Amino acid sequence: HSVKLNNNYEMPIIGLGTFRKNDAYNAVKAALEGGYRHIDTAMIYGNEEEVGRAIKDSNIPREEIFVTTKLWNTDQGYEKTLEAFNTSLKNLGLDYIDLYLIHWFKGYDNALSTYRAFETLYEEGKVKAIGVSNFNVHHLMYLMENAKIPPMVNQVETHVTLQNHFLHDYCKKNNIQLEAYAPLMSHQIKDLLSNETMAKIAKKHDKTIPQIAIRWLIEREIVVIPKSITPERIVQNFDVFDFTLDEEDMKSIRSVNTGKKIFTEFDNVDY
Amino acid sequence: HSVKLNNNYEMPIIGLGTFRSKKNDAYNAVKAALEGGYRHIDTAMIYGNEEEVGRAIKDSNIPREEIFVTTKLWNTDQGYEKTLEAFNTSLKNLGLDYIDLYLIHWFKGYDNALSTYRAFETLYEEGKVKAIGVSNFNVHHLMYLMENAKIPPMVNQVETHVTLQNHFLHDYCKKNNIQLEAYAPLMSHQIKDLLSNETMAKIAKKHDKTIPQIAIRWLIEREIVVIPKSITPERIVQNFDVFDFTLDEEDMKSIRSVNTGKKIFTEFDNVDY
Which of B263, B271, B273 is most worth mutating to test chain A (most A CB atoms within 10 A of its CB)?
A: B263
- Select which of B9, B27, B38, B47 is catalytic: B47
Q: Which residues contact B123 (CB under 8 A, 6 or more apart)?
A: B84, B87, B102, B129, B132
Distance CA B118, CA B96 (A): 22
Secondary structure class of B122 (helix, strand, coil): helix
φ, ψ of residue A105 to 5 degrees: the values are: -90, 125
SS (HEC) of chain A: CEEECCCCCEEECECEECCCCCHHHHHHHHHHCCCCCEEECCHHHCCHHHHHHHHHCCCCCHHHCEEEEEECHHHCCHHHHHHHHHHHHHHHCCCCEEEEEECCCCCHHHHHHHHHHHHHHHHHCCEEEEEEECCCHHHHHHHHHHCCCCCCEEEEECCCCCCCHHHHHHHHHCCCEEEEECCCCHHHHHHHHCCHHHHHHHHHCCCCHHHHHHHHHHHCCCEECCCCCCHHHHHHHHCCCCCCCCHHHHHHHHCCCCCCCCCCCCCCCCC
Distance CA B210, CA B219 (A): 15
Distance CA B29, CA B20 (A): 12
Q: Do A268 and B138 touch (CB under 8 A)?
A: no
Please list every residue in chain B followed by a chain break, i.e. its C lies more than 2.5 Å from the next written N: none
What single-letter amino acid sits at B17?
Answer: G
Please list every residue in chain A followed by a chain break, i.e. its C lies more than 2.5 Å from the next written N: 20
First CA to last CA distance, chain B: 35
Handedness of CA A123, A223, A171, A103 (dihedral sign): negative
Please give the angle made by the CA atoms of A70, A72 and A74, to the nearest 5 degrees.
160
Give contacts of A259 with chain B, Cβ < 8 Å.
266-267, 270-272
CATH superfamily of B1-273: NADP-dependent oxidoreductase domain (3.20.20.100)
Task: Tell me which residue of B167, B98, B159, B92 sits closest to B128, measured CA to CA.
Answer: B98
Handedness of CA A184, A185, A187, A189 (dihedral sign): negative
Distance CA A148, CA A160 (A): 34
Q: Do B164 and A268 touch (CB under 8 A)?
A: yes
Q: How far is A159 from chain B (nearest CA, A)?
A: 12
Please give the angle made by the CA atoms of A195, A196 and A200, to the nearest 5 degrees.
125
DSSP at B14: B
Q: Do A268 and B143 touch (CB under 8 A)?
A: no
Task: Tell me which residue of B154, B144, B93 sits closest to B124, measured CA to CA.
Answer: B154
Chain A interface, Cβ < 8 Å to B: 136-138, 141, 162-167, 255, 257-261, 264-265, 267-270
Question: Which among B139, B259, B271 has CB closest to A268?
Answer: B259
Domain residue spans of chain A: 1-271
SS (HEC) of B200-251: HHHHHHHCCCCHHHHHHHHHHHCCCEECCECCCHHHHHHHHCCCCCCCCHHH
Give contacts of A141 with chain B, Cβ < 8 Å.
140
Half-sphere exposure of A141 (CA within 13 A, CB side): 10
Exposed/middle/buried for B81, CB within 10 Å: 0-12, 13-18, 19+?
exposed
Quickly count: other Cβ atoms within 10 Å of residue B147's Cβ. 9
Distance CA B189, CA B186 (A): 8
Secondary structure class of B73 (helix, strand, coil): strand
Nearest residue in chain A measured CA to CA from B264: A260
Handedness of CA A133, A110, A143, A120 (dihedral sign): negative
Q: Do A166 and B270 touch (CB under 8 A)?
A: yes
Q: Do B168 and A267 touch (CB under 8 A)?
A: yes
Q: How far is A136 from chain B (nearest CA, A)?
A: 9
What single-letter amino acid sits at A142?
Answer: Y
φ, ψ of residue B127 to 5 degrees: the values are: 75, 20
- CA separation, residue B141 to residues A137, A164, B122 (Å): 9, 15, 21
Beta bridge partners, B238, equal: none
Distance CA B249, CA B203 (A): 12
Q: Which residues contact B222 (CB under 8 A, 6 or more apart)?
A: B170
Distance CA A216, CA A222 (A): 9
Distance CA A97, CA A8 (A): 16
Query: For A227-258, b where at least 16 C-beta lie within 10 A, e where not — what string?
Result: bbbeeeebebbbebeeeebeeebeebbeebbb
Distance CA A119, CA A113 (A): 10
Asked if A165 and B107 count as a contact pair (C-beta separation under 8 A), the reply is no
Secondary structure class of B265 (helix, strand, coil): coil
Distance CA B37, CA B257 (A): 32
DSSP at B40: E
CATH code of the region A1-271: 3.20.20.100
- Select which of A36, A45, A115, A181 is catalytic: A45
Q: Do A267 and B139 touch (CB under 8 A)?
A: yes
CA A266 to chain centre: 16
Structure-determination technique: X-ray
Task: Tell me which residue of A3, A1, A5 sits closest to A128, measured CA to CA.
Answer: A5
How many angstroms is the resolution? 2.6
Task: Tell me which residue of A168, A16, A166, A10 sits closest to A98, measured CA to CA.
Answer: A10
Half-sphere exposure of B195 (CA within 13 A, CB side): 5
Half-sphere exposure of B133 (CA within 13 A, CB side): 28
A45 is a catalytic site residue: yes
Task: Tell me which residue of A252, A235, A262 sits closest to A199, measured CA to CA.
Answer: A252
- CA separation, residue B147 to residues B140, B143, B171 (Å): 11, 6, 18
Which of B156, B166, B168, B256 is most worth mutating to test chain A (most A CB atoms within 10 A of its CB)?
A: B168
Asked if A180 and A150 count as a contact pair (C-beta separation under 8 A), the reply is no
Asked if A51 and A18 count as a contact pair (C-beta separation under 8 A), the reply is yes
Q: Which residues contact A19 (CB under 8 A, 6 or more apart)?
A: A45, A47, A227, A229
Task: Tell me which residue of A141, A108, A114, A107 sits closest to A130, measured CA to CA.
Answer: A114
- CA separation, residue B64 to residues A254, B57, B91 (Å): 46, 8, 14
Which of A265, A269, A271 is most worth mutating to test chain B (most B CB atoms within 10 A of its CB)?
A: A265
- CA separation, residue B133 to residues A6, B107, B214 (Å): 39, 12, 27
φ, ψ of residue B248 to 5 degrees: the values are: -80, 180
Q: A58: alpha, beta or left, given left = phi > 0 and alpha = psi -120 to 50?
A: beta
What single-letter amino acid sits at B85?
Answer: E
Distance CA A66, CA A152 (A): 15
Task: Tell me which residue of B234, B240, B223 sits closest to B182, measured CA to CA.
Answer: B223
CA B165 to chain centre: 15
Q: Which residues contact A220 (CB under 8 A, 6 or more apart)?
A: A168
Secondary structure class of B104 (helix, strand, coil): strand
Asked if A182 and A213 count as a contact pair (C-beta separation under 8 A), the reply is no
In chain B, which ranges are continuous DSSP H helix?
25-36, 50-58, 80-93, 110-125, 139-148, 167-175, 191-195, 198-206, 211-221, 233-240, 249-256
Size of interface A-B (CB pairs under 8 A): 60
First CA to last CA distance, chain A: 35
Task: Tell me which residue of A193, A210, A179, A133 sits closest to A14, measured CA to CA.
Answer: A179
Instruction: Give the H or E element holding residue B16.
Output: strand B16-17
Quickly count: other Cβ atoms within 10 Å of residue B169's Cβ. 23
Q: How far is A140 from chain B (nearest CA, A)?
A: 10
Quickly count: other Cβ atoms within 10 Å of residue A95's Cβ. 11
Handedness of CA A56, A62, A65, A70 (dihedral sign): positive
Q: How far is A241 from chain B (nearest CA, A)?
A: 28
Q: Which residues contact B243 (CB under 8 A, 6 or more apart)?
A: B1, B220
Q: How far is B27 from chain A (nearest CA, A)?
A: 31
Nearest residue in chain B measured CA to CA from A108: B168
Question: Which among A165, A255, A265 has CB closest to B263?
Answer: A265
What single-letter amino acid sits at A35?
Answer: G
- CA separation, residue B76 to residues B72, B201, B273 (Å): 12, 41, 8
Half-sphere exposure of B18 (CA within 13 A, CB side): 35
Question: Which among B138, B165, B266 has CB closest to A260?
Answer: B266
Chain B interface, Cβ < 8 Å to A: 138-140, 143, 164-169, 259-263, 266-267, 269-272
Asked if B170 and B178 count as a contact pair (C-beta separation under 8 A), the reply is no
Task: Tell me which residue of B236, B265, B255, B238 sits closest to B157, measured CA to CA.
Answer: B265
Q: Do B270 and A261 touch (CB under 8 A)?
A: yes
Distance CA A106, CA A102 (A): 9
